[PDB]
Design a protein around this ligand. Structure first.
Ligand SMILES: [Cl-]
Ligand SMILES: [Cl-]
Length: 162
């Protein structure tokens, strides 16, 4: 297992524009197009992302390409974030993947607001961080996924993904 497989499990793969769990227009493997309510806006952002007139539909290949870019950006975002980088640097390889997952889902910003958890992770207080992370909107809204990511931080293994 790795970050790509892990996220492919959490996000799925859809080749037509769809609404995510928050009702926002997405496509592919969790690639958010726009927070706007307008499908047109969504189609527009999509064509601009792919570089062609898609008409709201993309191929597997195109989805994977967006995916690679998005994972790369998430990593790079962490590494540029003063609150995140240090946490990330302190972790083992499995747990780093958990941290990338969260950033991919919620943005650097949303993640950086888990201040207290982050510190606990940094201190390697696994059980504690897990409990603190569960008291979040994130957990309450997407509980099954959050559970998987949390277990990953708690154990440092991929068991939740097996
Ligand atoms: Cl893009
Ligand atoms: Cl979920």
């Amino acid at each position: 297992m790795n970050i790509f497989e892990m996220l492919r499990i959490d996000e799925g793969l859809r080749l037509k524009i769809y609404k995510d769990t928050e009702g926002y227009y997405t496509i592919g493997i969790g690639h958010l197009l726009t927070k706007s309510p307008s499908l047109n806006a969504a189609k527009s952002e999509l064509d601009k992302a792919i570089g062609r007139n898609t008409n709201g539909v993309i191929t597997k290949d195109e989805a994977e390409k967006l995916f690679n870019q998005d994972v790369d950006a998430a990593v790079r975002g962490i590494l540029r974030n003063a609150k995140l980088k240090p946490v990330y640097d302190s972790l083992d390889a499995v747990r780093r993947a958990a941290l990338i997952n969260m950033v991919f889902q919620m943005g650097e910003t949303g993640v950086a607001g888990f201040t207290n958890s982050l510190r606990m992770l940094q201190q390697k207080r696994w059980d504690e961080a897990a409990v603190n992370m569960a008291k979040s909107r994130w957990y309450n809204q997407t509980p099954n996924r959050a559970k998987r990511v949390i277990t990953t931080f708690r154990t440092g293994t991929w068991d939740a993904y097996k």
